[PDB]
Structure formats: structure tokens, C-alpha cells
Design a protein around this nucleic acid. Structure first.
Ligand SMILES: [Zn+2]
Lengths: 406, 149, 49, 48, 97
DNA sequence: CCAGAAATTGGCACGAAAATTGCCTTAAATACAA
DNA sequence: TTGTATTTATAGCAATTTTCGTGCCAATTTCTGG
């Protein structure tokens, strides 16, 4: 019953475009239609980690070959201060056949003692050893920490704390102090010099709370619009040639259709946003843990549209709320059952799991079975495997990898 | 101004061409001591990788540098500060959803809080000193207030 | 690098004067190219030129 | 002292090493001026 | 040879006179490294320069030292290499001046 | 102290639900000529 | 008076692909009692 004319397909395709893509398409269509239109600083030089390293290199008594090797080494240093390439790549980049790996090793060791100490380290173990080598021998637990870092670091990252006792032949009193001394170091020596700027996004729709009720409105700073060029439209009448009149009429028709399509897209987006805000009202008042498990079919029934239209509209569009900026698809989620009769959204379950894990006993972290048992007191009835999946999504290590020395 | 006992005479060239000679008692009595007040501002905004947080947990800095901050990450009233001291502690989130084995090792050894977080705290500019006499907090409506507010 | 952008607080990049002039010239040139390719009436191409 | 990028670094390195000598070089503002004049459709260049 | 490569980028141009004249269209084309076709400057989504824009990296040079735009080549061992995907030379970022 | 038992973890599998994507030139309102 | 050409209005259906929670079970870690 729906006739797919090549322009209805163009109107439908306009729904799923973000603001930037829509602006680019509007510009592209604007440069082809004459009747469409749209309604000293220099800066400062900032010093980064590599600039500091090269400044220290230039003031170090290196030879020409050593200076070239140092330049190659400093080139392959990331923001965190770690060497991103093997020394074989540096040797190849030197391009001279008279230099062995030993000279590169010596130059790298000289560079690793620059400021900050531990920069240009091969890995975490090397950085920790470099940092520990600068401590005076009077440190109470220098030797135990050095042994643990040098020999047994994988089982320290596995939070064993029992096999470590057997291999190192220590006790809890000394092992805890050694672990604290290890944790007192700097995992990222290269972050002392920080450079950059956070990146922001421009929301498409703004929701506020006025006069006790939530108001949703399109963001006027980014809403796209076009306009009819009246100068060329005044020439639509006869201009001593029929072809000019036909051209003007066709271009005016296309421009008017495009303006209508843009207005319809904006209206549809506004209505969908209003429906979404009305459906999820507890979230904007009390944050997460109160999300409702709504789907596309829930929104598609309150606006008398189809599920495909709702799916297309909610793609890559952002909503700004007193809580933050969201993707307008973050409000759609799956659900689990409820003992009292109902549904619980997966976002609320993830928030509850995060809150429960964040307030557990460090000596005995909760397992997935314990989390399931705790959740089965509020009437959620979520499976252990689902809890494990949620925890993995939250990027939280398992129970045996969260215990401390207490 | 102030009433000063003054004599009109040359004194060894120390009043040559509009120069003024001042006794030490004027300095000792603090007759020309003045009070100057300066204001500093720290703004926490909303980014794409989550919002910026004003907090006391700056992972890279040491324990001493956070000694003059309260539980909310704000300097105490009456603290003596100098150049480089932290006034308000703020962290800017950095977000990546992929964990390399090196990043997993770092998270396991030093905790996940140190990762995916930057430092953007407010600090006293070099050559500036004084005493913290007033702190004011402005919060957007709908945002939870901290203890200081 | 001789005509840099203005990076300010809030992520705004704005624009410079030379960049604005170049953008206007490029937009006019592209519109003129498209109109010449489409064989538009002379009354419009003269105004575009 | 002002706008010779290599000259500043070389002078600083020589001063730290106790050698009070300089390699003058070319100011960068002159290159900026040359580029700006070339952007006006005028061919200005150094020769020999 | 990296030593000669590093020594050849700090050389001083030798001259004794300044010449001025009119610019031919062929001279202007020989000056350029590419043609600007679009009025975009920054993508505003990846915060990287848009292709064929006023800040394009294929025309004016890399935005980072010895790195192409997509990231296939990243270090000094690939200096002078033109990436086949993005067309950005692997060289210093000062060539944009 | 040892070792078996008990508990924990996550890759793979499964059916249903949910989300995504291609479609190709129609019918009805309305102004105007005969 | 009406038959006919010109302008609006038309953003759903129906396959097809992806994600969901959750069970199965082998591998790995912790525990207990002789
Ligand atoms: Zn590339």
C-alpha cells in the first residue's frame, strides 16, 4: 500500500542522519540548487613530554651517533612514557650497519634516567625496577619489593597472596608492607606533563524541569533550516525563454519539497523525544536504578508510527539532561522478571551490581552467586550467568582478583 | 593617607630628583600596609566521556599535596597556600573500551581508579601567595550538592 | 599553520577571518561550477560570477 | 633571542657548555611574510 | 642514513638578493601540493581535518610527527613513505607552515 | 600436610525476541479550461 | 455547469540480521577433615 517513489525513499533516509551528516547533505544539495539558501589570534607553544625529553637530550653529552639513537628512542615514546617499539626497530631506523644492539641499550639506559625517572621503559616491570633503583638503601622494605617486582609479578597481578608467600618465603607483616611500597610507585611516569583538551558534543534536544514538570525542546543552536531565494524566485515568470522558466519552476519545487522534509524530520524527532522523556520520568528525578524496560514497540504505539520509523529516528542523536548527555538509545534496554510481578531493567540491575560491589568487604569479595543471592531479596530473580555477564560488561574483575591484604 | 613627620633637607643624595627617604619605624608600625584580595575560579563541565568530577582522589599525586583539601576536594578556609598548591581537585575522564594486556596488568597492580582518569585540578599560579578566606560553590539545578555547599 | 583556529573553553573552535574568506570563495566557486555544468540560464550565472 | 627556532636551541646549548658563540640563521617572520605575499599572487623569492 | 637525514633538515639557505615579479598560473600550480575543493575544516566528530578541506592532511601535511592520518605508518623507520590509504606523507608536522 | 570435594568462572549453544534494512514512480486534493 | 491536469501527501510492510537471558560443563580456585 506504500508506493516507494524515489523521493519518499529520500524522505525516509533523512530520518537516520545525525546533525553533522544532515548539514553536509544540506550543503551538498545547496550547492546544486540555485533557489536554496541558508538563513588576531595566534596561540601559544605548549611543551609536551617529547619536547621535554628532546630538551634534556640536547643538553646531554652525546655523540652524533648517540644523539641520532636518542632521537629515534624519544620519537617512539607515547603519552604515558612507555617505549612503543622494540629496539630492533630502532636499530633498523638508524640505517647504519656499524651499530650493535649494545649501543642502543646504553643510550636507552641513559635516557631512562631523565626526568621523569622511568620514562621510555620497555614494560611495567622495567619501569618499576628503574624507579626502585633510585631509592636509598635505607628504605625499610626495598629488597622484598625488588624481589617481588623482578621475579613474581604475574601472580601478584592475579592477587594470589598465598603462592607468593610460599615462593618468597615471607609473612603477612612483611608482605603487606612490600605490596604497599610497590603500590607507592608511579605506573605512568609520562603523565607528569599532560597536554590536550576534552572533546565535547552538541546535543540535539534539551530537557529541563520547569514549574514542576519536564519540558523537552529542540536545541536551537543546531537545528538545520533552509530558505527560498526570493531573488531567483522573482524570475519564475517569463524571461524571454521557456527553458529558464522550466528550470526555475523545477528547482523551486525541489527546494520546497526539501524544506517540507526537513520540517517533518524536526517535528518527528521532537515528538519522539517528548514520548521518550514522558515514558522514562523516574530516571530524570532519581538517576539510574529506576529505569523502565521500554522497547521500540512501546514508543511506536504512543506516537502511532511504525517501529522502523522509531528505529531510524533515534540513531546518533543526543539528549542533554541535568544528569548529563545521552544517546537517546541508552533509554532502551532488556529486562528480567520480578518476584512480586513485573519487570526490572538491565540498566538498573547493572547499577545495583556496581553499587553492591563498590561496598563489599575487601578481604572477602562477593562472588556472582552471592550477588545473585543479594539481588534475590528485592525480588529480581536474575541468573548467575546474567550477573557474570553484567559484571564483565562493567569491566569488574572476578571475586578472586578483587581481594586485598587485610 | 597618614600623617607623617617630615623634614625638608638633602640627605646624602637619597632624595635626589623626587626620591623619598623613609624611616624604619614607619615600616615597623605598618602605617602603609595594605590588604589585597584575589579570586580564582574552577569550572567543572560535562564532556562526551562522562562528566568531570570535583573529588579528593587524584591518583598520581602524593599524600602531602592533598593535605589541605577537605573531603569534598576543596581547600580549607584559613590555609596558607603558595605557588603550585592545589586549591580544587578535579579529574577529567578519558574513555577507551578496549583493554590491552599492559592496561589490564596496570589495572590489576595499581587499581582501576588510576586508569581512565586525568588531572585538571585548580592550582595557585606561580608567584602568588595568600590565605584562603572565602570559598563559594555554584551548582546547576538538578545536580547533587556536596558537603561544602 | 599560519592561519590557525581558535581553541577555547567548551570545545568551541569558531573561525578566523582568512578561513571565512576562503570558505566564501570556495562556496561561490563550487556553486558556479555546478551551475555551469547544469547549463543554467545566463541571468543566474552572471550574478554568480 | 626572538624567532630563530634552531638558533635559540643552539645558543642555549652553547651557553650551557660555556661557549659564547651563535649561529644567526633566518628569522621565521620573514618566511611568514614571504608566504603571505605569495598568497596574494605575487612571485617573491630569494636567489643565489 | 639517519644522521645525514637529521643534519639535512637544519641547513641554512644561501642567498644574496630578493626577486619580485608576477605569478603565472603554472607557477601557482607548481607552488601547491594539492587542490582545495571543500569548505570544511574539522570533522567535529573525530576532531581530525576533513579530506580536501582547508586543513587537509593529504595536501598540507601530517598533524603529528611521522604519522599518517589513518595510522598504518607511525615511526621514523617509515620516513618519506606515502600511505596508499590516506595519501599522507610520513614526515614532520612543521611542513604545514 | 594431602587430596579430594566443593565452589567459581566463562566459552559455547539455543530459541525467542528485538532491531535493522530494502522497496522504484501511487492516490487524493484542487485549480482550470470547454 | 463538469472532466482533467497539476499539485500535494505519502515516512509503512515484510524479510532479514542481531542481540537477549540462561543453561551446559570443562577448567580453575578455594576449602575442609582426617
Ligand atoms: Zn595512512
Amino acid at each position: 500500500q506504500l508506493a516507494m517513489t524515489p523521493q519518499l525513499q529520500q524522505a525516509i533516509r533523512l530520518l537516520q542522519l545525525s546533525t553533522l551528516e544532515l548539514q553536509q547533505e544540506l550543503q551538498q544539495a545547496l550547492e546544486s540548487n540555485p533557489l536554496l539558501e541558508q538563513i588576531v589570534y595566534q596561540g601559544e607553544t605548549t611543551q609536551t613530554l617529547q619536547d621535554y625529553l628532546m630538551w634534556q637530550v640536547e643538553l646531554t653529552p652525546f655523540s652524533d651517533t648517540d644523539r641520532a639513537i636518542a632521537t629515534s628512542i624519544v620519537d617512539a615514546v607515547d603519552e604515558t612514557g612507555y617505549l612503543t617499539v622494540p629496539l630492533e626497530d630502532i636499530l633498523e631506523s638508524i640505517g647504519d650497519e656499524e651499530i650493535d644492539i649494545d649501543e642502543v641499550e646504553a643510550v636507552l639506559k641513559r635516557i631512562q634516567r631523565f626526568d621523569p625517572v622511568g620514562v621510555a621503559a620497555k614494560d611495567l616491570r622495567d619501569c618499576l625496577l628503574i624507579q626502585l633503583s633510585q631509592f636509598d638503601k635505607t628504605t625499610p622494605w626495598l629488597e622484598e619489593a625488588r624481589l617481588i617486582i623482578s621475579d613474581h609479578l604475574d601472580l601478584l597481578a592475579n592477587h594470589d597472596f598465598r603462592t607468593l608467600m610460599r615462593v618468597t618465603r615471607l609473612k603477612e607483616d612483611v608482605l603487606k608492607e612490600a605490596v604497599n611500597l610497590i603500590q607507592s610507585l608511579d605506573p605512568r611516569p609520562g603523565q607528569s606533563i599532560q597536554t590536550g583538551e576534552p572533546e565535547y558534543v552538541i546535543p540535539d534536544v534539551l530537557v529541563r524541569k520547569h514549574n514542576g514538570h519536564w519540558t523537552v525542546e529542540l536545541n536551537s543552536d543546531s537545528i538545520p533550516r533552509l530558505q527560498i531565494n526570493q531573488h531567483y524566485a522573482s524570475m519564475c515568470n517569463n524571461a524571454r525563454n521557456d527553458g529558464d522558466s522550466q528550470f526555475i519552476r523545477s528547482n523551486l519545487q525541489d527546494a520546497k519539497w526539501l524544506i517540507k522534509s526537513l520540517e517533518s524530520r524536526n517535528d518527528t524527532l521532537l515528538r519522539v523525544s517528548r514520548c521518550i522523556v514522558e515514558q522514562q520520568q523516574a530516571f530524570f528525578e532519581q538517576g539510574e536504578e529506576y529505569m523502565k524496560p521500554m522497547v521500540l514497540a512501546d514508543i511506536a504505539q504512543a506516537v502511532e508510527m511504525h517501529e522502523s520509523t522509531i528505529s531510524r529516528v533515534t540513531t546518533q542523536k543526543y539528549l542533554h539532561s541535568p544528569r548529563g548527555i545521552f544517546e537517546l538509545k541508552y533509554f532502551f534496554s532488556s529486562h528480567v522478571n520480578t518476584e512480586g510481578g513485573g519487570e526490572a531493567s538491565s540498566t538498573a540491575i547493572r547499577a545495583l551490581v556496581k553499587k553492591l560491589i563498590a561496598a563489599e568487604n575487601p578481604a572477602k569479595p562477593l562472588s556472582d552467586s552471592k550477588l545473585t543471592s543479594l539481588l534475590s531479596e528485592q525480588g529480581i530473580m536474575v541468573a548467575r550467568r546474567t550477573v557474570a555477564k553484567y559484571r564483565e560488561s562493567l569491566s569488574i574483575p572476578p571475586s578472586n582478583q578483587r581481594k586485598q591484604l587485610v | 593617607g597618614q600623617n607623617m613627620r617630615v623634614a625638608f633637607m638633602p640627605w646624602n643624595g637619597y632624595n635626589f630628583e623626587d626620591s623619598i627617604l623613609v624611616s624604619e619605624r614607619v615600616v615597623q608600625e605598618d602605617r602603609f600596609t595594605t590588604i589585597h584580595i584575589q579570586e580564582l575560579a574552577c569550572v567543572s563541565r560535562d564532556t562526551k566521556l562522562g562528566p568531570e568530577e570535583i573529588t579528593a582522589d587524584i591518583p598520581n599525586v602524593g599524600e602531602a599535596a592533598l593535605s589541605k583539601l577537605d573531603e569534598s576536594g576543596i581547600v580549607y578556609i584559613g590555609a596558607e597556600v603558595t605557588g603550585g598548591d592545589i586549591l580544587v581537585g578535579k579529574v577529567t575522564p578519558k574513555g577507551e573500551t578496549q583493554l590491552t594486556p599492559e592496561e589490564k596488568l596496570l589495572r590489576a597492580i595499581f587499581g582501576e581508579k588510576a586508569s581512565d582518569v586525568k588531572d585538571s585540578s585548580l592550582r595557585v599560579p606561580n608567584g602568588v601567595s595568600g590565605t584562603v578566606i572565602d570559598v563559594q560553590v555554584f551548582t546547576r539545578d538538578g545536580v547533587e550538592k556536596d558537603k561544602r555547599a | 599553520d599560519l592561519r590557525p583556529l581558535v581553541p577555547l573553553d567548551g570545545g568551541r573552535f569558531a573561525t578566523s577571518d582568512l578561513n571565512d574568506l576562503y570558505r566564501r570563495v570556495i562556496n561561490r566557486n563550487n556553486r558556479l561550477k555546478r551551475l555551469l555544468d547544469l547549463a543554467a540560464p545566463d541571468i543566474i550565472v552572471r550574478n554568480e560570477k | 633571542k626572538s624567532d630563530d627556532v634552531n638558533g635559540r636551541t643552539k645558543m642555549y646549548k652553547n651557553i650551557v657548555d660555556g661557549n659564547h658563540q651563535m649561529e644567526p640563521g633566518m628569522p621565521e617572520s620573514f618566511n611568514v611574510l614571504l608566504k603571505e605575499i605569495r598568497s596574494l599572487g605575487i612571485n617573491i623569492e630569494l636567489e643565489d | 642514513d639517519l644522521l645525514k637525514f637529521l643534519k639535512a633538515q637544519t641547513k641554512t639557505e644561501e642567498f644574496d638578493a630578493i626577486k619580485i615579479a608576477l605569478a603565472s598560473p603554472d607557477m601557482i600550480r607548481s607552488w601547491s601540493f594539492g587542490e582545495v575543493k571543500k569548505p570544511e575544516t574539522i570533522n567535529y566528530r573525530t576532531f581530525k581535518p576533513e579530506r580536501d578541506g582547508l586543513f587537509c592532511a593529504r595536501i598540507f601535511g601530517p598533524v603529528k610527527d611521522y604519522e599518517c592520518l589513518c595510522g598504518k605508518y607511525k615511526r621514523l623507520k617509515h620516513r618519506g613513505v606515502i600511505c596508499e590509504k590516506c595519501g599522507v606523507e610520513v614526515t614532520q608536522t612543521k611542513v604545514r607552515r
